[PDB]
Amino acid sequence: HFYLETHCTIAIPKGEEGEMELFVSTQNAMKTQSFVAKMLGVPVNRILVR
């Protein structure tokens, strides 16, 4: 692909109820959210992707 900006993610752990807010260079916020959630073992509503 050679997108000038390579892959990048910033994940912010709140410390409450497994909550996490992520800033990601992605075309798929949904999958990023569910995939992060699945790996963590928390409901999808705990993950916010921006």
């Binding site: 709140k14 410390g15 409450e16 109820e17």
Partner: protein, 49 residues
């Protein structure tokens, strides 16, 4: 009594409220004394201000 030093008395606390209908689902918490959802995190200092 004017010569008596302050004496704390024994506390007494009673709360009265109504129970929910006998046939109300265990998952329907409306009317039940459910603790504040963030209370555990507030007690642990994890709640973020």
């Amino acid at each position: 009594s004017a010569t008596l030093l302050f004496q704390k008395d024994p506390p007494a606390n009673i709360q009265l409220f109504q129970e929910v209908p006998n046939g109300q689902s265990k998952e329907d918490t409306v009317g039940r004394p459910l603790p504040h959802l963030a209370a555990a995190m507030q007690a642990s200092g994890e709640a973020v201000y």
